[PDB]
Amino acid sequence: AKIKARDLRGKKKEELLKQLDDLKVELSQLRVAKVTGGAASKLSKIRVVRKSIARVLTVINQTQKENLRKFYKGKKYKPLDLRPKKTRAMRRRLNKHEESLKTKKQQRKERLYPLRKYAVKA
Amino acid sequence: SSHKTFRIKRFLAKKQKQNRPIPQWIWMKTGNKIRYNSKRRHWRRTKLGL
Amino acid sequence: MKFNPFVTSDRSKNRKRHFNAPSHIRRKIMSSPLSKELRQKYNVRSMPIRKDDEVQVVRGHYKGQQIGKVVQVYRKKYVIYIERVQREKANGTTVHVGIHPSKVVITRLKLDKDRKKILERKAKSRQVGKEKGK
Amino acid sequence: HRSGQGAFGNMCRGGRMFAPTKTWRRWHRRVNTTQKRYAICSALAASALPALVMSKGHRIEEVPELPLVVEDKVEGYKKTKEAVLLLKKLKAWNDIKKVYASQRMRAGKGKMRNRRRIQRRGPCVIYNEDNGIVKAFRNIPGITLLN
Amino acid sequence: NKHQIKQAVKKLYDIDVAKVNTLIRPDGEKKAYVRLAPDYDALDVANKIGII
Amino acid sequence: TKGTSSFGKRRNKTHTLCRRCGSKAYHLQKSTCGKCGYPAKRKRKYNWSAKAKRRNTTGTGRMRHLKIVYRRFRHGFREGTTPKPK
RNA sequence: CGCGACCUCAGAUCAGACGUGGCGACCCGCUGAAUUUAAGCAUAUUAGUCAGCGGAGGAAAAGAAACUAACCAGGAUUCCCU
RNA sequence: AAAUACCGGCACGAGACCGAUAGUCAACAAGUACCGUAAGGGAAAGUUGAAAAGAACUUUGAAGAGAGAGUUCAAGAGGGCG
RNA sequence: GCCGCCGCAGGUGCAGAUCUUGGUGGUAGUAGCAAAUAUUCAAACGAGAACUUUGAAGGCCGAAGUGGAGAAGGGUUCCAUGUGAACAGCAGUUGAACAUGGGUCAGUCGGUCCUGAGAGAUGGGCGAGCGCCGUUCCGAAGGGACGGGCGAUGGCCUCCGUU
RNA sequence: CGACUCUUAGCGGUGGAUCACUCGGCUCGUGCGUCGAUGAAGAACGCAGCUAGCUGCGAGAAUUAAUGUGAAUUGCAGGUUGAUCAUCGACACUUCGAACGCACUUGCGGCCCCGGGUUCCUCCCGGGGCUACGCCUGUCUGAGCGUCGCU
C-alpha cells in the first residue's frame, strides 16, 4: 500500500493525522532495530518512511494555506505571508493607476496637439 | 579545562566526529580519485587554535 | 558549416557537454541502428536501445551472426551488456564485457504502449520533409 | 613550502615575464586606396598567361580554354548534383579531386586550438547576381564564390 | 528539558517515572538516565520495546 | 631570559570567537572584533588589501537566497500561477 | 475656583505606511599624500592622482541660456573628428 | 528620452595566444594542508589499459620480500603504474 | 602524430647573475646516541628476550618527595580487545602510534545572582562624514502601592486575586 | 695472478627532463542589467542504511509536490496505476548576523490566550501570540502666571 499523493487530497482534514502518526510508529521501531541488530529489510525501509511522512506533511499545509489565501482574496489588508511579493524595490515602485494619470491641461494639450501621420512627396 | 561553555564543548565535538579514516567502499566506486586522508589531526603536533 | 552563432565548433566545450552530461539525454547518444527489415517497415532508422532489445555485435572480437540479448544498460559508463558476450576471470567466475552502442545492431524491439509513440512520430517528420521537398 | 623563495623577477619561478604584453599593441595596418586598387589588375592578368596558373598547382591541362567563361544559366543552380555534373563537363573535376586528396591532419598546437583538418585551394567562381549559385557549390570543398 | 522528557516516556510506553538524570557526550548528544517505579518492572517493559 | 624562559609564562588568551565573522579574533578586553568590528553597525573593509576582500564576498559562501533570485529573474518574476494539469 | 477656543509642547506595545545593512566594475559630493622630475632643493612637478569618509542607478551626472560672437550672424545637453 | 561610460554580476560566441617550473594563487577535497596572539601570510600536487582481463592452483617463509603457473598485441604497461 | 620549398609573425639560441625551482655527490659508515650513583638470577607467554609480565636479591627518591590531589592551558591523550607496516634517533611482545569499541548522571559542589578598579547607552552637545565627547552634567527621566469612592468579572459576583 | 684506482661499452639501479595528449587559464566581443525588517551578504551547528572530505539540502534535512521526460540509480546488500532525469510556478527553511523584550554567561523578565496539576485557584510543568530604535499621516489621554473668552 504505497501512498500515492494524488489520492491524499480530497479526504477529511483530521483523518490524515491518524495516518501521520502511524508512519511515526511504523518508523520508531526502525531506530531500535538498526541499534540492536541487523536486518536490511528494516535498515533500507527507514528512507521510505522518512519520505512517506514528508509526503503527508506537505498536503496538510498546501491545502490549509490555500484556505487562508481564498479567505483573504478580496480583502485590502491581509497578512504578510499572503501579499504581492517578488523583489523589495519592486514592491515600492508606483502603481498601475499612479502611472496612467493625466492633468486636465495635458488632457487638454494632447487633445488639440497629438502627433500626426503624413508623408513627404519626392 | 574541566569547567567549560556550552559553546566550546560543541566545537570540540564537531572535530572528533570528523577526525577518523575513510571507509574504503568510497574507493571501490566508478571514477574515483582519493587515495587516503591527509586532513587527519593529531593532538601532539597541531593545535586547533581556539 | 554550422552558421547559427549559438552553437560551438570547440573541442574542449563539446567534450565537456559530453563528459559532464545527464542521465536522460544519455538515452539518445547511446542509440543504435535498426536492422535491414526495420528500416523497410516502420520508417525508423536509429533508435534508443532498451532493456530486453535483441541485438547483434558487428565490431571487435565478439562480432558475427548470433542474435543474443541485452541484460543491462550502464549509462554512467556509456556501454550495454549482452547475453553471452562475456569472459572468464582469474578465479573461474565469468564477468560481463561491455559494448558501446554504435557497435551493435538491434534485432527485436521491446514494443510497449509508450515505445510505439517514438516509432509513429518519426514516421511523420521523415515523411513531411520528403513530401515537402519532392 | 612557499616562503623565502623568489618573487618578482623574470628569472623566478612564479613571477612576472619580461615586458608583459598589452592590448594596445599596433595590430592593424593601412594601405592607400590606389595600391589595394593597383594589385587586382595583376592578380587578374596572371590568372589567364596560362603558364602561371599551372605553377599554382592547378589541374588545367585538359581545360578547354583561356580565362573560362559561361552562359548565364550557372547563376541559378541550387543543386550540387547539377553543379558537380557541370564541373565534369568543362574538364576541371581533376582539380577538386586534387582537393579531396589534399585533406589531412595538421602538425602542431594548431590542433588543440581547433584548426585541425587542413586542405588545398581549388577553382573560384565570379558572378553578377546570386540567384542560387552559393547553395550548389558551397558544399564542394575548395570552391569560393565571389561577386 | 527534563520536565519535557518525563511526559514523553510517560505518554508512549505508558509507565510512571521517579527521576530523569542527564548529561551531554563528547560527540555532542543528550543521554537521559530514566529511573522507574516499583509497581512497574524494567526487564519486562524493555522486552516490549525491543532492547534486549 | 628574553628568549625561551619567558615563552614559558603562557596560559591565557587575548582573542576568541567573534559571532558574526566567527573568526577567532574578537578582542576580549576591548570588546570589538579585529576582523569586522562586530559592535559597529556596518562592517570593516578596505581598498589597500584586495586579497583581503576576495576571501570574503557574495560568491564565497552559500548564497542561499541569492542563487535563486538569479534563477527566478529570466522569465518574468512569476508569482501565484501554476502550470496546466493532466 | 470653575467652563470653552486657540497657540506652543508631553506620552503610548494606540490605527496604518516608510528608513538602517550588503555588493561596488562604471556615476555623483567631500577630504587628500610622499616616493618620484628639476642631474642639489624650499616655489613648481607628481596631482586634485594613491589611501580615508559619504550617496545612488541600469547607466549616472548635464540640460532648453543673466549662451558664442563682432559675422551676410549662429541657437538645450552629451559624444567622436578637427 | 537619445546619442556616452561598464577589469563587479547573469548567460553566451571566438581566438596568427599559454600548454602542467607555462597559463589565474588555484587543470586535482584551494583561497584548501600549514604558520602568526591579531592585522594578515598562503603551497606542493594531471597521465595503467582497448577493456580490470588488477596476477585462481602450487611452493620457501612468522612477515614483508621471492620461485614457477596465468591475462594482455606488451607487465620490456603490476594500482603515485604513457 | 610529422616534414620540405615561397612568403608572414614573435614572450626565439646560455657556463656563469653569493641568479629561480627540482634532483644528486665527495666529506662519511665518519661527528656522534657521556648531566642528576646500579644492577643481577630464575620462570612463564613467542618464529625472535640486555630492555616487556610475574617472583627473589641489591639500590635511589627520603614528607621543601621521582608520594597524594587541583587551577590555567591541552581536547579524548582516560579504559579495556587487538595489530606489528610506519612513527616512539639501538630493539618492542611495549606505547600517550595505529584499528576497532565503551566511558563524564547533582535543589544541598560551581557558574548564574551583587558590586570592585574600571567598561558604556539615552538627554545634551561637537561633527563634511562613518562617528567622537561625556555619565549626573542645558532633561516633563517614578507605569507602582494601603486605603476613599464610581461601575464591571469569576465560585451559590456570598468573600477576594483580576482590571 | 688478486684488491684498489681511471676510461669506454653492455645490462640494472636511482631520478622525473623530453615528446605526445588537456572537462583548466589568459584576451576580445556581443547581449541582459536582478540584494535587503515579507529578515540580505556573511557565519555557526545539524541532515545519508553503509559516509570522513568537496557537493547539495534544513527537524518535510543528498530533499516534498507539480509540469515535462518516459525504465533507471549502482561501489555492494535491500527494495508502466510512472523508475530515473531536467523544469521550477504550489508547500517549507535550526542558531547567529542591519538583527529587534533585557543581556551574551546560551542567562533573567513582562503582557494576553489555550491544553494538562484544574474543576482559574493563585503559585506548577507544557504550546502558541505580542514586548528594538528613528520618522510621516491621522486618532486617544494631557501640561503650560503662552494668548484671549463668558459667568
Supply F79's cell numbers: 508569482
Q: How far is CA F79 from CA B3, D14, F73, F82, in A?
A: 53, 52, 12, 9
Residue from E22, E27, E30, E31 whose CB has the most chain B CBs within 10 Å, to mutate:
E27
Distance CA F58, CA C27 (A): 38
Neighbours of F39 (CB within 10 A): 10
Q: C1' nearest to CA of F13: which nucleotide?
A: H37
- Environment class of C80 (CB within 10 Å of its CB; exposed 0-12, middle 13-18, buried 19+): buried
- Which residues 6+ apart lie within 8 Å of E38 measured at CB? none
d(CA C75, CA C13): 21
* CB of B29 nearer than 7 A to strand H: no
- The DSSP secondary structure of B1-50, one letter per residue, reads --S--HHHHHHHHHHHHH-SPPPGGGGSSSS----S-S----TTT-----
CA dihedral F41→F43→F46→F49, nearest 10 degrees, is 150
Name every chain E residue with its beta carbon within 8 A of the beta carbon of B13.
25-28
A46 with A27: CB under 8 angstroms?
yes
Judge contact between C18 and C73, C-beta under 8 A. Answer: no
Asked if B12 lies within 8 A of E27 by C-beta distance, the reply is: no
- Residues A77 and A89: their CA atoms lie apart, in Å, by 20
Contact (Cβ atoms closer than 8 angstroms) between residue E35 and residue E19: yes
Best CA proximity match to D85, nearest among D127, D40, D140: D140
The span from the CA of A49 to the CA of A62, in Å, is: 21
Find the residue in A nearest to E52 (Cα): A36
Query: Which residues in chain F have Cβ-Cβ distances shorter than 8 Å to B50?
Result: 16, 24
Q: Residue F53, CB, less than 7 Å from strand G?
A: yes
| Residue F86 marked in a binding site | no
Chains that touch A (3 or more CB pairs under 8 A): E, F
Query: What are the distances in angstroms from CA F54 to CA C121, D35, F37, F49?
Result: 54, 54, 18, 9
For strand H, which residues in window 25-54 of chain F come within 7 Å by CB?
25, 34-35, 46, 49, 51-52, 54
Phi and psi at residue D106, to the nearest 5°: -100, 170
- Neighboring chain B residues of E25 at a CB cutoff of 8 Å: 13
How far apart (Å, rounded) are the C-alpha atoms in residues A59 and A4? 12
Which residue does chain A place closest to E13, by CA atoms? A25
Is the C-beta atom of F13 closer than 7 angstroms to strand I? yes
Report the chain A residue with the minimal C-alpha distance to residue E48. Answer: A29
Radius of gyration of chain F (CA): 23
CA distance readout (Å), F45 to A19, A75, B44, F35, F51? 55, 47, 37, 9, 11
Lookup: cell for B35: 587515495
Of B42, B3, B4, which Cα lies nearest the Cα of B20?
B42
C82, burial (CB in 10 Å: exposed 0-12, middle 13-18, buried 19+): buried
Contact present, A and E (at least 3 Cβ pairs less than 8 Å): yes
Cell of residue F77, nine digits: 518574476
At E39 the three-state DSSP class reads coil
How far apart are the C-alpha atoms of C58 and C108, rounded to whole Å?
16
Contact F79 A87 (CB under 8 A): no
Give the residue from D88, D123, D119 showing the smallest Cα distance to D105: D119
Q: Do chains A and F touch (3 or more CB pairs under 8 A)?
A: yes
Which resolution in angstroms does this entry have? 3.2
The maximal CA–CA distance of chain E, rounded, in angstroms, is 36
DSSP structural state of residue C68: E
Check if the beta carbon of residue D124 is closer than 8 Å to that of residue D144.
yes
Distance in angstroms (rounded) separating the CA atoms of residues C97 and C79: 9
Alpha-carbon distance of F31 to F29, in angstroms, equals 6
Whether E12 and chain B come into contact, CB under 8 Å, resolves to no
In the structure grid, which three cell numbers stand for residue C86, read together? 562475456
Give nucleotides in strand H with any atom < 7 A to a protein C-beta: 9-15, 17-19, 21-23, 25-26, 28-29, 31-35, 37-44, 51-56, 70-71, 80
Integer distance in angstroms from CA C39 to C1' J71?
25
Strands C32-33 and C46-47: antiparallel
d(CA F31, CA F25): 10
Closest CA to D75 of D8, D2, D134, D138: D134
Q: Are A29 and E50 in contact (CB under 8 A)?
A: yes
The experimental technique behind this entry is cryo-EM
Chain C CA closest to residue D139: C1
H/E run at residue C84: strand C80-87
Of the candidates D10, D5, D7, D11, which has an alpha carbon nearest to the alpha carbon of residue D20?
D10
C-alpha gyration radius of chain A: 30
Integer Cα distance of A116 and A120 in angstroms:
13
